[PDB]
Each structure stands twice: as structure tokens, then as C-alpha cells.
Ligand binder design. Structure first.
Ligand code: LP9
Ligand code: MN
Ligand code: MN
Lengths: 400, 554
């Protein structure tokens, strides 16, 4: 028997256009899906199925990735406000957190017959020489948010012994990934992870290492120079004025006092010392977390990224504009797109660890450039939501 | 004409909707007769079957012109039939087909009639031939095969067509069969002997599954006219283009001209269209004569010159790389060529699109690279190696300092004037010994009136009045003033993030004349530094221009 799944009323299944793929990626998918079919995991379908979801191939063994973002929106009630997997606060505090791909667990559990038609995907052909190769799932698919919701019961069973034997180890599940955290020495951690993999192995399952306790905020940094030009104070007041909008108790009145009359930019003006009081106290406030800002479990997370040049990228996570939950950075052949997809991934996994959900990304890139290239460097099993924006010229420099 | 033995495709109505029940309109005795003759014949062939008044559904029928056609208005049924997945998400492009020694063309006669309909759906296709006037009950039929004009026929026939060819494709891997609609393109690199043989082998496999095709004496000969293309076994081109020389040109004549030209641009390099397209914008009256502008005339003349002698394209070799080349043709116009062997083009093309309000040549070049990259992937399954009229250093500089993430796959410089360059660069640091212009603008929202001006550290000053203006336009005017009255080295401080933005992106063209004026000034200068301060904060010189432009405004 299968656990019955329905959609939100008024809205039905996904009808998303499939992105054109390169020959090598098409061949890899054809092979993957041929094998997958000979094992009853998926079945060919006829044109009576109007539904469609994009499919991609990532990486030395090619693997299938299904963009279920649309299907997940249209079944959001099921995996959240119905069968939601709770989120442990301890995970962000751990010295070490290990991520394990656990999505092979889903192939064993069959999918509700009424639902299978919504998981339809097309493998496109080059130059449209044939129509696509249409398939639908018979078992829980990787990337669908309903799969971990259903498998929960089976997953608790698997982990029960290990959980009982190690009560200071956190296991959190997000989609196809299992997040395991401990405060143990790194050698012991990796031993417990090895141990855990053995437990999964007895149910036919199968790393990449994070250190969340060593995550510090990126403070908005004020210049620390001797001899200040007019332009520098103008730069300074602008940076602080915008910081007043987010940080409670930012002061600027002493800095303005210096700039009176129409002075030249290059003209050096020797400073006071009451302004140094503001410089210091603002610096003190700029390194601390923002007072008055708290994650709201009912609102979306937004992540914004700025290109800083020389392989550097700054980013901010918030729900209400400039009310920052978290700021940070990312540094580094290597290209802009590669760097951007790597930052997106880093930020997303940080967001999963901290809040239990992916942010909606605002990407400083051309929609088309991103869409043809993002897969070439993508490694994650999930895909976050993304917009395409123009970075305001000032925001960039206010984040160093 | 046989009806294929293949499995039926289950069809459903849209959730909670019943079949069509539209009344049959009273027909003339002439129309009724013709419908009866058509229908009995269609019934003999198995295409339709007789039903009684136990079937509650109905769909209207009409008859139109020696010979009559039967028409069935499936509007209501189509509005009630389930949605199907798109029959095709694109037509195959000739430039993406492999070269073949021998090639022949098959077509399926009476496509939809040759393929059965889901038994449990057949009852919804019911129609009625009415009797003379009111009188007696009409003869009631229903469809057994896919009916012409029904929503699901295109998808189901194609679906069936894949299933049928699939087994044949297996034990014939070194043969390619392209199929679109009821057309079949069969190519192989075998001799005229075992080719015509293997084709008559395919025909047999087709008729075994109720699909009828023409034999050797009937099957078509190259050049194959298809979808506006001329197709040979080793080359391809577009169908002959005729540009009619006209005493006067109406909007309609111009629209058709742009269309023919756009179509031809797939293979004829250098085709231009901008001046011709310029005439159509600011749209109205279809039959009104539009007098050609002088620019349009030499564009048209240049177009006739390219279309003077015929050009063809070649096919695709998977083992060889793709080389794409792009040239700048003029403002906003870009042209490209794709080939594998130097100057034997697979296809050509053009890019023009205006992305946003203010751009520059480097931005437009990478927009063209993206568009071509996508097209190559669709057509060939791989990206091409680019050859661009931009220096590596010029590209390096732009990419490094721009806010946007950008990428171009393997590319190389090629010296084909005009070369793509930046025309000015702003300063990183404020200039020593240059006048500092503090600029500002202000506009009233009711009167629409505005003032733009500057104050400088060298005591200088100016205010100008504007009438049909906005806050943004007064900021750009302020910066423009400062450029005119400054000389070759300037620092400018503004409180407009908007104006900062436009200028920092180093545009060289714009839809705005005012911005174009700022551009021509910027290039004339030697060193420009531009900076930003917060508005209404009582800052330095900004407070002084603030009082000026506001006077009698806000
Ligand atoms: C010579 C006089 O006959 C003609 O005027 C004439 C043709 O030569 C012709 C050739 C075709 O061959 C093709 C079949 C398939 C394709 N493709 C789609 C699968 C592209 C690979 C292309 C051409 C298809 N239709 C044709 N039609 O309709 C004609 O009226
Ligand atoms: Mn202003
Ligand atoms: Mn002002």
C-alpha cells in the first residue's frame, strides 16, 4: 500500500518547460533512465500526461537531478503544515556537521498511483530530431519534498539504534541529505560517521564536512586610517547613514560637523576627537548581531549576493529588507559563474543548517547566462529559488 | 486505407465536465446529401460508425465546396478535452542534420484516419446529419479514428508514430529517421543499391502497422521543399526570396519585407533590417504608404546586394568543432556565422535586441554570445568556439570591474573592424588640482517645473530652468551642466544613485538624448571622478546646490 498524497485545492500539477541539454548530458540521462526503468523505478508514458518537470545531469559518475521546485510549491501543504520534519537548534552550535546523501533510500518505497503522473519528465533530443523520452516515477523520487516526509517513519527506525547509542549526536534530515553533528574531536566524529554509514548500509544506503561553530558574522567595516580626506568622510557618512536603517543606535552627527562649505574632495582636513568616539562605538555595534531581528518561521528567507572583484563575493540573508539575519562572504582557473554557483551552494547549506529551509536568491547575473551554465558546476541534490537582479552601485561598496 | 493495429491512447475529459451537447443546425438538402455520401464512405472504410439516440452527445457538422468537404466544429469538445503534452517544443533546423550519401522522403497519407481512438472516448465525438427541415431524427455517427481538428489528434498520432518506428530504429542504428508531423526524412550512408532496399524494408514495417506510404515511382525527389527551406542531400538553403521593387511601399509591403529578410538571415550573412524596422514602429494604418527614409534605402539596397547571388549552408559533422564568428554592423546591429571548416557556413544569423535603457558594445557582444550559445546547444548539443572582435585585455578590464557576473566560453580575438572597445573610464581616486562640482536637481510634481545646477569649490555657480521634466531628468541635467562648464579634469559629486548607476556602467549608446549628450562630453574629457553622497543631510557642497535648485520649486 502507498500513503495517499493530494495537492493544494484550486491549483494542480506542474507544467514546466524542459531546458535544452548538451549531447553528453542527454546520453548520460538516457543511460541512467534505461537502467532505472529495467528496475521498475520509472515507466515510459504517453501524451495523455500533460505534466512536466525539468531534468538535468550533474557531477566522475554522471547523476540525475530533477528540478521539483514547482511540484514542491504545489504540494507545500503536504511536506510542511502536514508532515513536516522539525528543525533542531543545536545543529548550528556543533563543532562538526557532516552531510550524507541518503536519497537512495527512496527507491524502495512505492509512490501513490494517483500521484505518479505529476512526476513526469522529458529527456530532450538534439535539434528536436525525435520527440523527447517521457517518463514518470513509480517510487518516491529524489528531490521531491514529499519523499522525506513519507520516509520519516522508516528513517526513524534506521537511526533508532545509533540515536540511542549516541545521545549527543544530532541527526537532521533535509530532503535527500542527512545532517549529522557532534562536538567530538574530528577523529572521533569521522569514526562515528563511518559507524553511521554502516547502519545505513544494512538498509542499502551510502563525507563532506562542515564546522558551524566557527561561523562568525561579516561586520560592515569602517576604514581605520590616519589622515582622512573629504571624500573619505563623505564615504564614511554614507556608509553609516545606511547602517542607521538596520542597526539600532547608530550615530553620525559628529562626522557631518567636519563637512561644511563646498570643500574639495582631495583636501585633507585634520580630524577632531569627538568624531573618533562615534567611529569606535559604531565599529563596536557593527561587529555584533543586529538587535531586534528574529527569524520568522512563516516568512520566506531572501539571500542577496554582491560581486566584489578579485574572486570575492559578499552576501546577506534577511526576511525584511536590510534587517539582516546573517551576513557573510565567499572567496576563491576560475570564472564568475563557477564562483557564483559555489557561493549559492555554500549559502544554501548554511541556511539549511541554521533555519531548515533554502533562501530565495537574488542573483547579480543575466537570466540566460545563469540558466545555460549553472548545472556545469552545481553539485547539490536540491535547487533553491532564484531571481535575477541588478546590484545597486552603493550596496556593493557598503559591504566593503 | 488501413487503420493501425497499435494500442489505443486512453483519453479523459477535464475533471467534472461532461461531453459536448450542442444542437445541430438545420442544413440545406444539397449539404445534407453531400454529408450522407461522405459519411457512408467513411463508414465503409471503418473511419466512423453508426450510433442511436442512446448517445446523448452532439457536435455540429457543416459542408463546403464538384467536390464537398465535411467540416466538424470541435470547439466545444476541445474546450472539454484534457490537456496533452506539447507535440513538439521546436522544429528541427536543417543546419543540425548530419550529411548523408543517400536520402529519400516518405509521407504518411491520411495520418489521423490511420490511427484508432480510445473506445471509451469515441462516444463524445458523436455528430448528427440532420434530415430535411425538422421532420425525422438525423443519422448519428461517431469517430473510431483520430478526427481532424480535435485537440488530441496531433499528440496521439505523433505518440503512435514514435512507438511504431522504435523497434525498426533498434536493429537499424546506422540509419537516421527524422519525423515531423506526417513527414519522414530517412537518411543513411549506404549505396543507391542497399538504400532503396532498406527503405522499401521500412515501408513494409510501416504498412504492417497500418501506415501507408508512396513507393519508388511516387516518392519525392530533391531539392525537398519543407517548412520554407530548400533541402539537398549535401547542402541546404532557404526558399527563393523575391524583393519586389515598388513605386510606393505600404506598411503591409514593409512587414512582408522584414519577414522575408529575417527568414533569409539564417544563411545570408550581413542581412540588415533596423532602418526598415524603424519605419514600422510608431504603429498605425495597414494600407498607408510609408515613404522610405534615406537610411532605409541603402539598407534595402545593401540587402538586394547580398541576395543577388544564391548562398547555401552545409550540414553537421559531430567529430569536428563549431566555430562562431561575430561582427559589429552598426549601432545595435550584430551579425554572426557558424561553421566547422573556415567559411563553409552551417548557418548565419543576427542580433539586435535592446536590453534595458542604456548599454554599451561589450554588454551587447556578450548578449550575442549567450543567444548564440543557446542556439548551438538546441541545434548541435554543444557550444561553439567563439571568435570575437574584442581584445582580451578590453574584455579582461570590463569583466573585472563590472557588478554583474559574466562568462564567455573559449574565445579568441579576431581583428575585424569595427573593434569593440570602451570609450571612457572613470577615476578610482578623486583628482588633485581639479574643480569639484557639487551637482543637484529638483523638480515640482504638480507644476512639472524643474531646476538643475552646480556649486563648485572654486566659488563658481549656475542654475538652469526646465519645464517638461522629472526628478531624474534634473539630476542628469545637473551632471550634464557640470560637464560643459568644467574642462578636461573634473570631480563631480551627486546625490543621485540613479545617475551614478547609468554612468558607472560606461554606456556608449542610449534611448535618451540627454544621456547621449553626457556620453559625448565624457569621452572628450581626460579624467573624470564621480562620487555619491546622501541627499538632504546637510552635507558639504550638496547643501549649497540644495538651496539653489529648490528655490521656487520645493
Ligand atoms: C520536389 C517537389 O516536391 C515538393 O514541392 C515537396 C517536397 O519536395 C517535399 C519534401 C519533403 O521532404 C522532407 C521531409 C522531412 C523533412 N524534415 C522533417 C522530418 C527535416 C529533416 C524535410 C523534408 C517534405 N515535403 C515536401 N513537400 O510537401 C513538397 O510539396
Ligand atoms: Mn537630488
Ligand atoms: Mn536636492
Amino acid at each position: 500500500e502507498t500513503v495517499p498524497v493530494k495537492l493544494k485545492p484550486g491549483m494542480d500539477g506542474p507544467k514546466v518547460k524542459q531546458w535544452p541539454l548538451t549531447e553528453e548530458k542527454i546520453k548520460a540521462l538516457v543511460e541512467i533512465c534505461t537502467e532505472m526503468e529495467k528496475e521498475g523505478k520509472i515507466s515510459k508514458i504517453g501524451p495523455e500526461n500533460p505534466y512536466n518537470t525539468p531534468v538535468f545531469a550533474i557531477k566522475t559518475k554522471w547523476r540525475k537531478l530533477v528540478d521539483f521546485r514547482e511540484l514542491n510549491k504545489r504540494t507545500q501543504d503536504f511536506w510542511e503544515v502536514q508532515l513536516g520534519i522539525p528543525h533542531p537548534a543545536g545543529l548550528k552550535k556543533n563543532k562538526s556537521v557532516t552531510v550524507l546523501d541518503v536519497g537512495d533510500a527512496y527507491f524502495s518505497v512505492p509512490l501513490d498511483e494517483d500521484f505518479r503522473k505529476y512526476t513526469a519528465f522529458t529527456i530532450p533530443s538534439i535539434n528536436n530530431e525525435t520527440p523527447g523520452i517521457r517518463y514518470q516515477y513509480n517510487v518516491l523520487p529524489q528531490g521531491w519534498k514529499g519523499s522525506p516526509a513519507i520516509f520519516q517513519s522508516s528513517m526513524t527506525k534506521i537511526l533508532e539504534p545509533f540515536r540511542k547509542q549516541n545521545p549527543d549526536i544530532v541527526i537532521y534530515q533535509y530532503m535527500d541529505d542527512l545532517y549529522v553533528g557532534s562536538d567530538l574531536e574530528i577523529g572521533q566524529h569521522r569514526t562515528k560517521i563511518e559507524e553511521l554509514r554502516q547502519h545505513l548500509l544494512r538498509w542499502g544506503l551510502t563525507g563532506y564536512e562542515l564546522h558551524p561553530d566557527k561561523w562568525t558574522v561579516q561586520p560592515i567595516v569602517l576604514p581605520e586610517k590616519d589622515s582622512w580626506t573629504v571624500n573619505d568622510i563623505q564615504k564614511l557618512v554614507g556608509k553609516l547613514n545606511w547602517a542607521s536603517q538596520i542597526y539600532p543606535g547608530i550615530k553620525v552627527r559628529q562626522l557631518c560637523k567636519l563637512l561644511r562649505g563646498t570643500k574639495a574632495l582631495t583636501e585633507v582636513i585634520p580630524l577632531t576627537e569627538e568624531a573618533e568616539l562615534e567611529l569606535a562605538e559604531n565599529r563596536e555595534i557593527l561587529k555584533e548581531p543586529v538587535h531586534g531581528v528574529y527569524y520568522d518561521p512563516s516568512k520566506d528567507l531572501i539571500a542577496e549576493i554582491q560581486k566584489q572583484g578579485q574572486g570575492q563575493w559578499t552576501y546577506q540573508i534577511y526576511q525584511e529588507p536590510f534587517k539582516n539575519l546573517k551576513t557573510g562572504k565567499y572567496a576563491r582557473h576560475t570564472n564568475d559563474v563557477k564562483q557564483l554557483t559555489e557561493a549559492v551552494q555554500k549559502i544554501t547549506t548554511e541556511s539549511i543548517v541554521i533555519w531548515g529551509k533554502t533562501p530565495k536568491f537574488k542573483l547579480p547575473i543575466q537570466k540566460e547566462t545563469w540558466e545555460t551554465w549553472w548545472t556545469e558546476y552545481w553539485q547539490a541534490t536540491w535547487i533553491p529559488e532564484w531571481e535575477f537582479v541588478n546590484t545597486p552601485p552603493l550596496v556593493k561598496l557598503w559591504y566593503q | 486505407s488501413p487503420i493501425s493495429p497499435i494500442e489505443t491512447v486512453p483519453v479523459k475529459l477535464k475533471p467534472g465536465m461532461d461531453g459536448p451537447k450542442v444542437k445541430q443546425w438545420p442544413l440545406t438538402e444539397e449539404k445534407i446529401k453531400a454529408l450522407v455520401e461522405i459519411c457512408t464512405e467513411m463508414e465503409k472504410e471503418g473511419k466512423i460508425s453508426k450510433i442511436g439516440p442512446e448517445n446523448p452527445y452532439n457536435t455540429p457538422v457543416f459542408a463546403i465546396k464538384t467536390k464537398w468537404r465535411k467540416l466538424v466544429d470541435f470547439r466545444e469538445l476541445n474546450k472539454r478535452t484534457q490537456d496533452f503534452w506539447e507535440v513538439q517544443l521546436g522544429i528541427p533546423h536543417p543546419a543540425g542534420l548530419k550529411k548523408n550519401k543517400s536520402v529519400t522522403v516518405l509521407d504518411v497519407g491520411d495520418a489521423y484516419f490511420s490511427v484508432p481512438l480510445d473506445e471509451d472516448f469515441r462516444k463524445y465525438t458523436a455528430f448528427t446529419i440532420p434530415s430535411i427541415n425538422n421532420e425525422t431524427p438525423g443519422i448519428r455517427y461517431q469517430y473510431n479514428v483520430l478526427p481532424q481538428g480535435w485537440k488530441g489528434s496531433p499528440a496521439i498520432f505523433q505518440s503512435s508514430m514514435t512507438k511504431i518506428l522504435e523497434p525498426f530504429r533498434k536493429q537499424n542504428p546506422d540509419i537516421v529517421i527524422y519525423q515531423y508531423m506526417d513527414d519522414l526524412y530517412v537518411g543513411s550512408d549506404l549505396e543507391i543499391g542497399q538504400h532503396r532496399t532498406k527503405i522499401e524494408e521500412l515501408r513494409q514495417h510501416l504498412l504492417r502497422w497500418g501506415l501507408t506510404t508512396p513507393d519508388k515511382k511516387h516518392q519525392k525527389e530533391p531539392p525537398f521543399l519543407w517548412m520554407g527551406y530548400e533541402l539537398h542531400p549535401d547542402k541546404w538553403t532557404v526558399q527563393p526570396i523575391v524583393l519586389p521593387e515598388k513605386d510606393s511601399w505600404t506598411v503591409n509591403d514593409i512587414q512582408k519585407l522584414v519577414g522575408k529578410l529575417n527568414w533569409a538571415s539564417q544563411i545570408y550573412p550581413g542581412i540588415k533590417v533596423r532602418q526598415l524596422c524603424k519605419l514600422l514602429r510608431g504603429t498605425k494604418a495597414l494600407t498607408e504608404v510609408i515613404p522610405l527614409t534615406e537610411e532605409a534605402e541603402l539598407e534595402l539596397a545593401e540587402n538586394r546586394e547580398i541576395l543577388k547571388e544564391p548562398v547555401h549552408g552545409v550540414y553537421y559533422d559531430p567529430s569536428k568543432d563549431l566555430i562562431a564568428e561575430i561582427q559589429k554592423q552598426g549601432q545595435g546591429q550584430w551579425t554572426y556565422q557558424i561553421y566547422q571548416e573556415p567559411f563553409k557556413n552551417l548557418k548565419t544569423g543576427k542580433y539586435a535586441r535592446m536590453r534595458g535603457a542604456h548599454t554599451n558594445d561589450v554588454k551587447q557582444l556578450t548578449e550575442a554570445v549567450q543567444k548564440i550559445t543557446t542556439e548551438s546547444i538546441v541545434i548541435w548539443g554543444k557550444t561553439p568556439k567563439f571568435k570575437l572582435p574584442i581584445q582580451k585585455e578590453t574584455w579582461e578590464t570590463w569583466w573585472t570591474e563590472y557588478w554583474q557576473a559574466t562568462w564567455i566560453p573559449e574565445w579568441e580575438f579576431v581583428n575585424t573592424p569595427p573593434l569593440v572597445k570602451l570609450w571612457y573610464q572613470l577615476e578610482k581616486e578623486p583628482i588633485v588640482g581639479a574643480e569639484t562640482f557639487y551637482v543637484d536637481g529638483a523638480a515640482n510634481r504638480e507644476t512639472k517645473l524643474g531646476k538643475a545646477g552646480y556649486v563648485t569649490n572654486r566659488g563658481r555657480q549656475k542654475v538652469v530652468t526646465l519645464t517638461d521634466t522629472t526628478n531624474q531628468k534634473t539630476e542628469l541635467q545637473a551632471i550634464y551642466l557640470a560637464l560643459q562648464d568644467s574642462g578636461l579634469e573634473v570631480n563631480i559629486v551627486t546625490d543621485s544613485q540613479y545617475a551614478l548607476g547609468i554612468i558607472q556602467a560606461q554606456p556608449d549608446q542610449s534611448e535618451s538624448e540627454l544621456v547621449n549628450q553626457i556620453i559625448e562630453q565624457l569621452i572628450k574629457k581626460e579624467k573624470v571622478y564621480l562620487a555619491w553622497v546622501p541627499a538632504h543631510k546637510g552635507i558639504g557642497g550638496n547643501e549649497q546646490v540644495d538651496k539653489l535648485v529648490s528655490a521656487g520649486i520645493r
